[PDB]
Subunit: 391 residues, 4 copies
């Protein structure tokens, strides 16, 4: 058998909610159902055509058994649909798409859904199993413990960012300017209707309360440019660079893509949005995760013999402003082509979801024939990257 | 390009420890490192040849960031090794091998490690984020909440098994007979030294106490045949059949396989143990998970054009004695060919690990040219199955 | 022969306003409310703080309050380090039992001046997790209010459910209970608006850095009512044939009360006008479920002991743990309803459990006319009650 | 002139053995240990259970014990539902303060027979979590033993660190404290071997499903020693210039003690022969940090009150909160160490904080010879102490 070509038929997401904000009442798996149902609807195919599903989801504790299965059944897909939940930290939503693509390439399935979901609002605290130690019991926060602490260095993701800021000489003022730019671009894009095809509204229903329709990303409005340069450097008190404003935030949301072989898209007579050209993972020293996307991006370009100049649009996940700046600095690419409609610093970062979102955004924003490259760093020193071409 | 042939070059595991037992001090990721390091040593390849790693792991809460990365780096593999943690509940360890095989088939990597890990002893309790409700709250046990409760029926896996016992008329006595058979087979296999190429010992070190060397599975010695018929049916008060003895137990362990392309095995002067022929996933109603493996196995057989008679040995994961008996009954297979050297009822069931263990067991136990078929059910109504041939 | 005892007088009785649960005083620990009340009482008494020899404070839910709650309250009020302190727990009777035991010390001539009262911050009562191995399947975090405060150990049911048992026994219906409750709110509002707590309650300023000061000057709970809703409310303690509701039961609350007690001799020596004389007191206990009726027996013992008749009592303070309790007491004692809980009680003012026994004795002190007798009684979990007779001077 | 009071006698004094932390008695709630000691005390008294009119029990760490701990102990001992109950908290002094307050009631003639004592199950003391919203990043649930039991509120340090302060000021060195500690362990063992607790201690049977009964018939702690290791230990509360260690400090423990108290008249009515007469008692307080020396002033008060001299005391029980405390007391009082804590104490027998004050009065009761005076004293957190003088009959 020859490898099959893979196309993205649809890409849909919920709005991104703020921590304890507009979507905080909905579990991750419910956000997942919403996104999955929307993508199938946008693709114009029966739910029965979806053969298997992979969802990224980093913080699975307390979500109940088989989170992806919950999302899938919750969207009314057939009970025959096998489901797998994927965890590559912040790269989860992209790696799900990559692994689904590999299955399709093998001819093992012909139509799949892949994406990611996270409700950081509902991530619980943990108490260890065993005897309570004299003097007190520690209740750890899984966001911090599983989500945001580097295992090897025993520091926050934001302190690894500081490390890169030192080595690459990326200053506080530069990171602030980038963050302000992200907020600016996100607002402009929302005001321009650039997410009309990508985002689907979520209705939040509470007994005895009026329904609340969440139609846009929450985070980008949560900013005061005037305070930005005055904020404390929260990950490094002295001579720091990373702040609450220039870092990504904690958030809730889900994204899903319908993926198909070229043959399935033709059989079903759907109009594919983009072809998946290539993808790769790179890994580096854990503290150096901010630069991992540079190597992953380089890998994909080399794989298919393209040069950085051939890329119309770059999505370099805004884990921190520092990360994007480091990537631009090492790749020497045009900043006007990078995160053009905002990103995680201003839209928020539901960690298992963001890698899917940025691929979906390229699928909508690229013009016919253009190449888009999405890359995303992950805790532990990894990154994933994907190259797509708009059809 | 055409699909690459995938071979298993090594397959190694820790002993399985009892709940709060001999390996209970080790995190799942450390057990993972031990299995991964052992599999690479047995493979006889430079560790730098391992390109990427997938590990199954169902209960990831509190294990820290990127469990697979922790296992991999802990095994001394290069920081350049991308890592992804896989959750298909009890199928995780098998699904990891399947997904890694797809990557290899695509030519995306030529050498990978795939397996599973679980430390049920160290799975924590959770408290919801937010304000404490007047009157108190029970902190949920993640083994129960995420591992063992069916979301849709709101009952234990054990109670779902009861549903199948009723439907297929598989009585308490038959289940008990199967369980005794498993314990008997496990002891006989351990006494015959059948795991000398499969299991590697674990030394547990405690400061101020002597070393403990764990060299065999702990669970299978925890049995009393005279008591088996006397136990209460713990999942169902009236007309129950499932008991603590005839159900799998809660356990700790890890397993890892080194997978390669046939070309990479050739390049590296490696003599592989087995060829991965085909694999599949099936899903049915959540409550009917015990029968999913029947459909998954039939899928693989039909794909390859083998008849059930062509299979030399079957590994049908012993989630409950009930599960294996439903499979034997529906497939109409020789029970002397099924779980020949024991299984999860008596060896234990570290849920993320077992799917990998049973494939690794086939790789060692099959004779040259023989086909082995492994299948494993999973919460949510799923199963994975895989066919291999011994080389 | 009977002992010859010193005469005991109340020289001052002061309290904080009562705050609602998680309400206006919720940021202040019980011990801090204690300090405010104690300082208040001493200032009112017009004596040096150093004259106070010893202190007893009722306090039912002491968990997480820190070491020696009463000592904290006392040292926090600027009393000398030489002041011995004891924290008293007779559940809801704690505030009165503290005064009783202080009276006994005075009677014996073991001290000549004491502070006694009660304090409670139900807002700050914590949750608990057991010491030991975490059980498979879950770990309960228990609410100490429910576990230690409100659950009868023996019947394994809420105080409110025990109350239902007495409603049943004595045919006290929902409507009567509701009428009593409305009556309580009515009296509270009237008294508050008439200025009747002018010398009883002292204001509290709550300071939050960055926020405007809040001055709490009156009881919070009595404004929290809607008469129209009262009859509609669900019966929260019993699904079938219930009578007790959130409106006709006492609420959870924060507050402290403190009395300066001295021997007749010390009041003379210190040249202070005693407010009232403490005549007698008693404790009574019955079947745990039957606590609503324990104050009946306690009041009876007190009257029998002193040789007075129920008719001789000018003013009754029967703690409004539930409207039911007051009604049960009125029924069994056959007393003039118009003489009971004249200026409201716990149903409308709130029930910081360790404080209430002290507050009601303090109220009689202020409300009685010269020469009048007041009888205060209060039930407590476990099936007990305390009662106290005083006479205005 | 001076009040004429009822004579108070101790008719019995009984206790459970003291269990170690998480040890032999760890499965029993404090209230159950209370029931056992109370039942034993009434049996040893040879009186009807119905004769006990009221009950006071010391109990420092009441969190999670359920409603009204003393009521649970009393009703759990099979005493009448008519028995009023109050739970007393003066930290480590609780057990003694209970006896004192009961004595005061008896003196006033308000009751004629009472049980008074103390109980603590440190093994079963829970952790707490604040009411409200868990902060981002997690929280440490506090250990109530540490938070309510052992931390000085004002200095924000452990009792052990407060002890270091006194060691400094009075030049009480490590070696002296260690010598005292060994002496306590020696005396405890000698007394147990000599059968010195025959009438004082009652055995408890611990019953668990599936396992065989365990009969606990002696104090667990005094065996948990290694004399050779003692001077090798590091100083747990103060690393630089410390003196107090795990060995020479009291331990965490489970236990209950109960005494039958009655008026001299009641004893005659009931035809029981009393063990001792309760002569006088007092409370003293000093700076919170200085609690180790509070018992000196409390003891002096009692002697001055009755007009006796230190030399008139045949036996001293000075609670061994720390070896430091006893030495501080011996030094300031200038008394004969051979008459102090003669049959061991809290450093070796353990310190269930709410019971010890009652245990040490009970021990005096049994060990004194006819006519001899015994003085018991006990420090408490916050800077307090209680002391009691008894005379053997
Ligand atoms: C950075 C982080 C710790 C936020 O910390 P925080 O201090 O609790 O953030 P806050 O929202 O309380 O903001 C603190 C201050 O910054 C201000 N602020 C936050 N965002 C702002 C913005 N966009 N513009 C201006 N001001 C802002 C707030 O108003 C606040 O001001 P104040 O203290 O005077 O009230 C948290 O969002 C985080 O961990 N982010 C990283 C997520 C991550 O690491 N993801 C994975 C990537 S590898
Ligand atoms: C079944 C389960 C709840 C354990 O129940 P449990 O009652 O706490 O188990 P216990 O260890 O207390 O055993 C109970 C009794 O069975 C006995 N017993 C257990 N296994 C036995 C065996 N193999 N032979 C003989 N007796 C046995 C014990 O001796 C005990 O007897 P006792 O009451 O006289 O002491 C737990 O192991 C479980 O949930 N297993 C299923 C795991 C699962 O669902 N995995 C996923 C697959 S879908
Ligand atoms: C009764 C108790 C359980 C509170 O129950 P609750 O149902 O959570 O009380 P809530 O505040 O939520 O009130 C429930 C309803 O009653 C209404 N309500 C309460 N008090 C009211 C009043 N005074 N007037 C009018 N309506 C009132 C509320 O508006 C609410 O209405 P809703 O259901 O439409 O929202 C609690 O206060 C309690 O335990 N009280 C007894 C304390 C005690 O036992 N003390 C010791 C004595 S022995
Ligand atoms: C001191 C205290 C914290 C225990 O400390 P700890 O370090 O956990 O005590 P441990 O049981 O772990 O013993 C510590 C060491 O001392 C040793 N030790 C303890 N008691 C000993 C004894 N009687 N003889 C010899 N060695 C002893 C132990 O063997 C241990 O040695 P290791 O570190 O080599 O293993 C605790 O008992 C305490 O707080 N006591 C004071 C109680 C109190 O303040 N009560 C109120 C009075 S005001
Ligand atoms: Cl990685
Ligand atoms: Cl599935
Ligand atoms: Cl004190
Ligand atoms: Cl009582």
């Amino acid at each position: 058998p020859t490898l099959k070509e893979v196309v993205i038929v649809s890409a849909t997401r919920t709005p991104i909610g703020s921590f304890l904000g507009s979507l905080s009442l909905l579990p991750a798996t419910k956000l997942g159902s919403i996104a999955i149902q929307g993508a199938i609807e946008k693709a114009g195919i029966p739910k029965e055509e979806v053969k298997e599903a992979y969802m990224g989801n980093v913080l699975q504790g307390g979500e109940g058994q088989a989170p992806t299965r919950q999302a899938v059944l919750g969207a009314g897909l057939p009970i025959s649909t096998p489901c797998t939940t994927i965890n590559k930290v912040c790269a989860s939503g992209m790696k799900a798409i990559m692994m689904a693509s590999q299955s399709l390439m093998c001819g093992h399935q012909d139509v799949m859904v892949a994406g990611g979901m996270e409700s950081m609002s509902n991530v619980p605290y943990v108490m260890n199993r065993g005897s309570t130690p004299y003097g007190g019991v520690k209740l750890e926060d899984l966001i911090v413990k599983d989500g945001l602490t580097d295992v090897y260095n025993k520091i926050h993701m934001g302190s690894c960012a500081e490390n890169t800021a030192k080595k690459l000489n990326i200053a506080r003022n530069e990171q602030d300017a980038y963050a302000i730019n992200s907020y600016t671009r996100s607002k402009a894009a929302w005001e321009a209707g650039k997410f009309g095809n990508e985002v689907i509204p979520v209705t939040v229903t509470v007994k005895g309360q009026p329904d609340v329709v969440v139609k846009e990303d929450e985070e980008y409005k949560r900013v005061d440019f005037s305070k930005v340069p005055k904020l404390k450097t929260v990950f490094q008190k002295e001579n720091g660079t990373v702040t609450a404003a220039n870092a990504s935030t904690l958030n809730d949301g889900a994204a899903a893509l319908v993926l198909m072989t070229a043959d399935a898209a033709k059989r079903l007579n759907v109009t594919p949005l983009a072809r998946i050209v290539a993808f790769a993972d790179a890994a580096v020293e854990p503290i150096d995760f901010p630069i991992a996307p540079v190597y992953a991006a380089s890998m994909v370009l080399k794989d298919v013999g393209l040069k950085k100049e051939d890329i119309a649009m770059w999505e370099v996940n805004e884990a921190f402003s520092l990360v994007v700046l480091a990537n631009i600095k090492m790749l020497e690419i045009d900043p006007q082509k990078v995160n053009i409609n905002g990103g995680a610093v201003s839209l928020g970062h539901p960690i298992g979801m963001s890698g899917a979102r940025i691929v979906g955004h390229l699928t909508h924003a690229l013009k016919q024939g253009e190449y888009g490259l999405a890359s995303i760093c992950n805790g532990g020193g990894g990154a994933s990257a994907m190259l797509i071409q708009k059809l």
